[PDB]
Design a protein around this ligand. Sequence first.
Ligand SMILES: CN(O)C(=O)C[C@@H](CCCc1ccccc1)CP(=O)(O)O
Ligand SMILES: CN(O)C(=O)C[C@@H](CCCc1ccccc1)CP(=O)(O)O
Ligand SMILES: [Mn+2]
Ligand SMILES: [Mn+2]
Lengths: 410, 410
Amino acid sequence: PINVAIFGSTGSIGTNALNIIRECNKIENVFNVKALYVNKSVNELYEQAREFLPEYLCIHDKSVYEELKELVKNIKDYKPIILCGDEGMKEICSSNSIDKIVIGIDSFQGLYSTMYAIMNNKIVALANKESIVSAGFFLKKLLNIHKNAKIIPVDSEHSAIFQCLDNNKVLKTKCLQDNFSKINNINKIFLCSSGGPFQNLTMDELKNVTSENALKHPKWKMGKKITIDSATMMNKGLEVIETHFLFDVDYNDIEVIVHKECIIHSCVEFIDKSVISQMYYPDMQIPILYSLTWPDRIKTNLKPLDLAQVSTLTFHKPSLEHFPCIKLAYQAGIKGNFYPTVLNASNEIANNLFLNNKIKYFDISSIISQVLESFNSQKVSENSEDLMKQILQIHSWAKDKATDIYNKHN
Amino acid sequence: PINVAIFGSTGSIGTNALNIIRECNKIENVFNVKALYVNKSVNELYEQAREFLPEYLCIHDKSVYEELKELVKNIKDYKPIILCGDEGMKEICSSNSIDKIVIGIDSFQGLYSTMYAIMNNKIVALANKESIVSAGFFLKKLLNIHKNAKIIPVDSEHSAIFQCLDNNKVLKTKCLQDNFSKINNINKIFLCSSGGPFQNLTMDELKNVTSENALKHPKWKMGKKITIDSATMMNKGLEVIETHFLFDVDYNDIEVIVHKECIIHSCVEFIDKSVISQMYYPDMQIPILYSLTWPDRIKTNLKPLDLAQVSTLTFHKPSLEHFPCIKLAYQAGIKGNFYPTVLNASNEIANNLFLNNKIKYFDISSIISQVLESFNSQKVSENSEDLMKQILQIHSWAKDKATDIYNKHN
Ligand SMILES: CN(O)C(=O)C[C@@H](CCCc1ccccc1)CP(=O)(O)O
Ligand SMILES: CN(O)C(=O)C[C@@H](CCCc1ccccc1)CP(=O)(O)O
Ligand SMILES: [Mn+2]
Ligand SMILES: [Mn+2]
């Protein structure tokens, strides 16, 4: 049985994870859900506990902790360990009965739980791209210390890339390791993008797009922050840096391609120039499931891909003039050092300002650019603890610098 | 170093093989061409010998044997073992200095050299699909006896399929072994076809097509027999049976899909419904190379796929009414026993009759259908030598029946 913990079990990733676990378990008993962790959704967590009966429950918000304890008394033949806060999280990661941890939490807590999962040598199914972009150096160092820990990518394009690799090679290395691409014979990556809602818009039209334009009638329905990043293509920019760190692919060997059908999820060109790609309907259940079944696959009842019905797949180059956030991401990744930390942090601020109708489309890239221009490279700390503090300091500085730029112009 | 023999070195597969070997060896010394085998092209063989300096030369036509000996005296610092005929071929197959053998010969001599390669426990890069269709039972039986022999597919779609599989699983089985698909978690195959030159003709237009039409302006340039089979889609029919036998995939799980761009070479759906595909420009060098590098890949200087330039990929269902040979192939495969041997043999005759303007397009499938209707299933010989004789008898009978049917209606 695959023993799995879900962190952020009521968010999008966590709920998709439990859905595919439920459906697969109907076919064959394959997963044991050992732990669920949520912030504050005490009722939703009780409902999940009633179904999956995990050994561990944890809620972050101490003010709903007691409520959770009595709710759970309602469940027949069930006596879970019920914990709360950061230290419940740590206790779950240290448990010897847990093998794989799905990280469906953003920002701080996401990276923090990831760190604890790695320290305990677990398999970590990681969807949070911002943590790889911002703290890649730290994750790489930590993965080198904890030799049995592994990050398995859940971001759909990175899952696709991973699924295009020969496991006889993968098993000789692991993600985020130097030489990953050499060992796997990788030459180049095609990183597929939906292109978002604005591919056909002129520069003058882009000047006036609004957050409602970006959010309304969403092709793929997802959270607000990522929807805005899809609209600017900063999502793909982040995902370029994510690719580089996960797979040790040089930036000149990563090509963003706009594939509006979202059937081909990304492709890998090997050193003989043969190309392998992964394909399915847009659906996060496949990337999540693979992260938990790797290096194997199990049966599902998902809708089979009907290629004849799909009929046409298309591909075109993104215009860097229209989507300047892509160029900024490449520039930051190529400059290296903590420029990716800076890019991510400034985008966090700029994205949210645009979301809330405070700045315009090209102001997003303008602010990010100015913050990047304001950063001086720093010597990279050798010490793991010092390195994490350096990342946090830089993240905080960059957010502040973005906000200060806004406030001046405002 | 990879020690390779090429059987049929002056044909299309053989010359693509030597071209990719030459180019790859410029990058890094990887291949030793140990043996070359041709029918009668003494001058061309001498030129390949001058370049590749193989330890073995073999010519099937005894009447050019002496000529070859003299020619070779022209080569400085070179003293090859120079051989001839079927027995020269057996001698090459049994050499301990040869590891991999490319089978780029058709018909009898293709099957015969394949058998000897297997008997000598070699890796056999097999491009001759007809031998798998006609003699599948015998190849399976032989591979079960010779445990270290392996067939690696070179037919482009079958190479694609093979390239979409995880070698961590492939290495626990082998082509033509029962349970191959189970071990590799295969659910279903998308078998891509160019559709050939007649794909958009109406039924009235099809009645009238000629072999000149099928051979003229050929999308992909290749031999006449396969070009005719591409026109009727019997090529893909044969390739469905090839798929079944190489990969132990049920016929109901093989879908022919027309992909006119010939960039995606075929796709594999796994039991979770994730799909993996292999992609490159139409170029036999990739499938040939992979057959010789598997389970590894090596660097080439081939042109990199430009997906944005390619721009559009399309997929549609073939019409069984317009391409009845497809239906016949499925029916024959599904009925099993030696119906595939009959299908292959009767097609050999019907293809050639049409090529030479003796019958019309729909007569091809008519003759095939009638021969299949005649055939009575036979008890499958347990004995390997007996089984081969049985296949050869059925092949010979089926050709004569096709010819007889032609002669009556003539
Ligand atoms: C899903 N995913 O990993 C995303 O990054 C969102 C992406 C893809 C949305 C379509 C999709 C949804 C689920 C699974 C796969 C693809 C939007 P874009 O490419 O424009 O940046
Ligand atoms: C190349 N190959 O394996 C063929 O069977 C010929 C095939 C594909 C021709 C295009 C092609 C050439 C070289 C390599 C890959 C694809 C024609 P069809 O699909 O109409 O039956
Ligand atoms: Mn993504
Ligand atoms: Mn083929």
